[PDB]
Write a protein that binds this ligand. Structure first.
Ligand SMILES: *[C@@H]1O[C@H](CO)[C@@H](O[C@@H]2O[C@H](CO)[C@@H](O)[C@H](O)[C@H]2NC(C)=O)[C@H](O)[C@H]1NC(C)=O
Ligand SMILES: *[C@@H]1O[C@H](CO)[C@@H](O[C@@H]2O[C@H](CO)[C@@H](O)[C@H](O)[C@H]2NC(C)=O)[C@H](O)[C@H]1NC(C)=O
Ligand SMILES: *[C@@H]1O[C@H](CO)[C@@H](O[C@@H]2O[C@H](CO)[C@@H](O)[C@H](O)[C@H]2NC(C)=O)[C@H](O)[C@H]1NC(C)=O
Ligand SMILES: *[C@@H]1O[C@H](CO)[C@@H](O[C@@H]2O[C@H](CO)[C@@H](O)[C@H](O)[C@H]2NC(C)=O)[C@H](O)[C@H]1NC(C)=O
Ligand SMILES: *[C@@H]1O[C@H](CO)[C@@H](O[C@@H]2O[C@H](CO)[C@@H](O)[C@H](O)[C@H]2NC(C)=O)[C@H](O)[C@H]1NC(C)=O
Ligand SMILES: *[C@@H]1O[C@H](CO)[C@@H](O)[C@H](O)[C@H]1NC(C)=O
Ligand SMILES: *[C@@H]1O[C@H](CO)[C@@H](O)[C@H](O)[C@H]1NC(C)=O
Ligand SMILES: *[C@@H]1O[C@H](CO)[C@@H](O)[C@H](O)[C@H]1NC(C)=O
Ligand SMILES: *[C@@H]1O[C@H](CO)[C@@H](O)[C@H](O)[C@H]1NC(C)=O
Ligand SMILES: *[C@@H]1O[C@H](CO)[C@@H](O)[C@H](O)[C@H]1NC(C)=O
Ligand SMILES: *[C@@H]1O[C@H](CO)[C@@H](O)[C@H](O)[C@H]1NC(C)=O
Ligand SMILES: *[C@@H]1O[C@H](CO)[C@@H](O)[C@H](O)[C@H]1NC(C)=O
Ligand SMILES: *[C@@H]1O[C@H](CO)[C@@H](O)[C@H](O)[C@H]1NC(C)=O
Ligand SMILES: *[C@@H]1O[C@H](CO)[C@@H](O)[C@H](O)[C@H]1NC(C)=O
Lengths: 192, 425, 179
């Protein structure tokens, strides 16, 4: 900081560096909150249990990243515990890691999916890519079908959506004549 | 002009399949960390319930865009330990087990040619912040990048399953259960598909194999030479990052307020007068977020179109043989091989291209003794003295015979018919 | 869109009547202008989102029309374009705001192993099948169509000859019936 400078500003124009007037040192200000908290839940009418995925943080340092000291005791249970689990995306709290693999029920990310399973709780597992099936192969062996099935599949395709019309006047200006008069100059917008 | 030779051309085409999933926090973007501003943002909450919906609609879509492109078959096949494919070499495209992942050589080259400058562990930003990392500013302004559902190793596993099924069973695994077939016989099926008799393949199999191998080599050094080829994917990355950067830069606008800094307003003015200025800033930043979400929806629609095209190509060229012209490479399609790439797929379309044409004299039919003879399949070709029946796509002449041709009426109405005898066994 | 009418947009109130009853036209006009600007912005956002969804629906309807042309009105050779398996027919069924295609397809069911060879060396000349492949049950060879096991004796009409039988890799020895 040059002697004529006291405040530093980033590209967003919000002040980020400040020279402390008493002790002539530069201090950086960072947000005390952050984005990246995701809440994983089975649909209510099933259970109120939930898991919390904190993005791009080791669960060792989640308490300082989230500032769990200033949070309510109900939040602190999701800050640390025995259900800590690490993923490439981030780290997950409130879900029991399972080595077994199933289909994806509630996708978390980075190949991790969560589900509500059995004592009912929420498990988090690496999703499977379907059945593993090695196929035999030889330079002088073929497989010929001797029978068939006539299978009828179904597929649905949207064709149209609801045709809709908007009246600017009665939307913007319910019944007042003053507002309707003031809306004339914006007619070029509404006709658009 | 009938070809007398051929070339096995391998063409590489890249298709973006997905884009970076993103999420936005209204509260910490607009009203950074001040309670006074966030209270004023409650009345606009509905707008964010729109925005957070739209971005969510994009994010899930991107996962789906990957799935329908790569999850064609749920039977994860494994290539056999023995590589005996009639001289065909698939080392550069099949998985390499000497790596932590299962990426092939070509997949590794594709991955190394795209930067994808995006995971920054939250906590590194709280440290060396003087470097002014873009991702740190985005994260402090509430612009988080969610990760893709399918890991890169998992997409590589899907691609490996597709390759194994294609080489070990042809198209039979697309239409249900995989069925064995020697690779030479599979290539014979493909050659019959493009209208050239299979007997040529076994007569030139080694040559064909060599050509194929050479073509694969021409891909490798081509992908290891320059990164311009993947410009489709890199742009799809860069543009997204660009948008996010713009968003952060757009926080530096007054929008008619006295200043662009919320704390500056709240420090000069009081709640008496700061409310109108904060409302102006809130409206402007909400409009900026709406613009970002709309542009993201446009790009998501474009990526959905690209991914639907990629899925169609996966179904119609990797899982089968496409008779559509130019749909899968220039030439007559024979096979396709998928290769995962960052936020996209790469198709190696192998095609039959006739090489050495030669002038020939032809007639539409042959009048034997009054009746006109038309070829069952092929054309009548004369080298100057005699006549032969030749298949369209290859020069394999054979003497005219009653089984090569069929008769239809007398030989007076056909224009261009000529005189010659036809052998009768 | 209806819910977004409860936003001040910087005005003193979100209701026109409150503004017009508290303020005369002197100062009410600026407030009503702010409300008009905000509500017009909301309408523009709605129309833009509707255009995006219309583009989605138009793509889906183009796909539906292509499927109706290529599968209901014909037989599609494109793989997996109309159902899994080999396409036989398709039946349309109207649904609210959409179409439902019933794709009837042929799926091979029971597969059997068979030892195969690319060609057959009869008496020096190699024989290749016209439509089918050579399959052996252990002792004899038969020409069978590819999608169904319908073996039949090797015959000069079933196959065709091209050149000597030394160049083909994997050729096997057998006789061919000459009627
Ligand atoms: C081919 O598959 C069909 C069924 O998909 C077989 O038909 C069944 O045969 C058993 C025993 O005769 C009956 O109990 C079933 O009622 C039949 N099902 C139907 C729908 O008809 C048929 O036998 C198989 N053919 C061959 C040669 O394997
Ligand atoms: C068809 O084209 C290929 C091109 O490769 C020819 O193969 C080449 O022939 C020359 C001369 O014998 C050799 O020097 C090359 O080494 C061959 N290249 C490969 C990859 O094998 C082939 O001879 C041509 N066949 C006909 C009938 O014209
Ligand atoms: C298939 O192509 C490769 C050329 O890339 C052949 O040679 C191998 O290439 C890799 C490149 O990393 C080397 O690591 C190997 O040592 C090479 N092996 C040999 C025997 O040369 C490879 O041989 C070909 N596949 C077969 C079965 O021959
Ligand atoms: C092909 O063969 C037929 C008969 O073998 C030829 O027909 C003759 O043509 C000459 C000249 O026009 C006539 O004088 C004869 O009367 C025809 N005879 C018969 C039986 O048709 C025919 O000309 C030959 N084609 C050409 C180009 O010469
Ligand atoms: C297929 O038929 C040919 C012609 O009869 C066989 O050719 C010879 O067979 C004798 C014994 O039967 C061998 O001593 C010769 O070496 C064969 N000729 C050559 C050039 O090798 C041929 O052996 C038969 N194919 C097989 C695999 O036995
Ligand atoms: C007072 O200001 C001076 C200069 O900034 C600083 O050195 C000192 O620590 C401050 N506090 C006291 C008690 O002097
Ligand atoms: C967080 O976890 C990753 C796992 O690789 C490790 O590399 C890193 O050192 C850890 N950081 C901290 C502060 O624990
Ligand atoms: C699951 O995998 C981990 C690998 O570290 C292992 O430590 C653990 O014992 C396994 N648990 C079960 C129930 O298999
Ligand atoms: C075929 O004949 C035409 C006319 O003489 C000539 O222009 C052309 O170059 C020839 N093409 C070949 C392959 O000989
Ligand atoms: C045309 O083909 C026949 C049979 O192979 C041959 O006898 C004749 O010499 C060839 N004539 C020319 C000009 O190539
Ligand atoms: C082909 O073109 C030439 C020149 O116009 C003509 O002499 C000849 O009659 C034509 N062939 C036939 C069957 O008419
Ligand atoms: C065909 O042969 C392979 C290897 O011998 C075997 O794995 C496979 O099960 C056989 N097919 C059937 C239907 O048994
Ligand atoms: C193979 O088919 C022939 C047909 O005549 C039959 O005679 C023979 O018993 C069959 N052998 C086996 C192992 O199925
Ligand atoms: C086919 O495979 C077997 C063993 O894998 C081998 O002995 C034989 O030589 C091969 N034949 C051909 C034509 O590749």
């Amino acid at each position: 900081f040059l002697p004529f400078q006291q405040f530093g500003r980033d590209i967003a124009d919000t002040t980020d560096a400040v020279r402390d007037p008493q002790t002539l040192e530069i201090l950086d200000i960072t947000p005390c909150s952050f984005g990246g908290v995701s809440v994983i839940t089975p649909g209510t009418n099933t259970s109120n249990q939930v898991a919390v995925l904190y993005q791009d943080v080791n669960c060792t340092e989640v308490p300082v990243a989230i500032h769990a000291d200033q949070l309510t005791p109900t939040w602190r249970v999701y800050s640390t515990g025995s259900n800590v689990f690490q993923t490439r995306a981030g780290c997950l709290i409130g879900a029991e890691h399972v080595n077994n693999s199933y289909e994806c029920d509630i996708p978390i990310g980075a190949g991790i999916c969560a589900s509500y399973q059995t004592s009912q709780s929420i498990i988090a597992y690496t999703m499977s890519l379907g059945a593993e099936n090695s196929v035999a192969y030889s330079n002088n062996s073929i497989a010929i079908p001797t029978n068939f099935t006539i299978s009828v599949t179904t597929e649905i395709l949207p064709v149209s959506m609801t045709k809709t019309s908007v009246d600017c006047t009665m939307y913007i200006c319910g019944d007042s004549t003053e507002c309707s008069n003031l809306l004339l100059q914006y007619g070029s917008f509404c006709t658009q | 002009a009938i070809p007398t030779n051929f070339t096995i051309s391998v063409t590489t085409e890249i298709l973006p399949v997905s884009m970076t999933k993103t999420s936005v926090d209204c509260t910490m973007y607009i009203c950074g960390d001040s309670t006074e501003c966030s209270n004023l943002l409650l009345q606009y909450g509905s707008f964010c319930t729109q925005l957070n919906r739209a971005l969510t609609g994009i994010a899930v879509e991107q996962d789906k865009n990957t799935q329908e492109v790569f999850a064609q078959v749920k039977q994860i096949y494994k290539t056999p330990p023995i590589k005996d494919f009639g001289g065909f070499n698939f080392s550069q495209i099949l998985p390499d087990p000497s790596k932590p992942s299962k990426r092939s050589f070509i997949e590794d080259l594709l991955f190394n040619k795209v930067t994808l400058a995006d995971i920054k562990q939250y906590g590194d930003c709280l440290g060396d912040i003087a470097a002014r990392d873009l991702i740190c500013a985005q994260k402090f302004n509430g612009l988080t990048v969610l990760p893709p559902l399918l890991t890169d190793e998992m997409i590589a596993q899907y691609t490996s399953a597709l390759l194994a099924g294609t080489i070990t069973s042809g198209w039979t695994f697309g239409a249900g259960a995989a069925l064995q077939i020697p690779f030479a016989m599979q290539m014979a099926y493909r050659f019959n598909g493009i209208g050239v008799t299979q007997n040529v393949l076994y007569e030139n199999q080694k040559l064909i194999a060599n050509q194929f191998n050479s073509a694969i080599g021409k891909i490798q050094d081509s992908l290891s030479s320059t990164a311009s080829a993947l410009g489709k994917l890199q742009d799809v990355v860069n543009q997204n990052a660009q948008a996010l950067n713009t968003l952060v830069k757009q926080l530096s606008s007054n929008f008619g307020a006295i200043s662009s800094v919320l704390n500056d307003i709240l420090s000069r003015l009081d709640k008496c007068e700061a409310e109108v200025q904060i409302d102006r800033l809130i409206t402007g930043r909400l409009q900026s977020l709406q613009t970002y979400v709309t542009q993201q929806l446009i790009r998501a629609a474009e990526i959905r179109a690209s991914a639907n095209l990629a899925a169609t190509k996966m179904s119609e060229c990797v899982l089968g043989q496409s008779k559509r012209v130019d749909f899968c490479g220039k030439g007559y399609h024979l096979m396709s091989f998928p290769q995962s790439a960052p936020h996209g797929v790469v198709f190696l379309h192998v095609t039959y291209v006739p090489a050495q044409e030669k002038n020939f004299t032809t007639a539409p039919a042959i009048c034997h003794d009054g009746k006109a003879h038309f070829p069952r399949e092929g054309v009548f070709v004369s080298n100057g003295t005699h006549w032969f029946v030749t298949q369209r796509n290859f020069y394999e002449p054979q003497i005219i015979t009653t089984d090569n041709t069929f008769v239809s009426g007398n030989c007076d109405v056909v224009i261009g018919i000529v005189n010659n005898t036809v052998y009768d066994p």
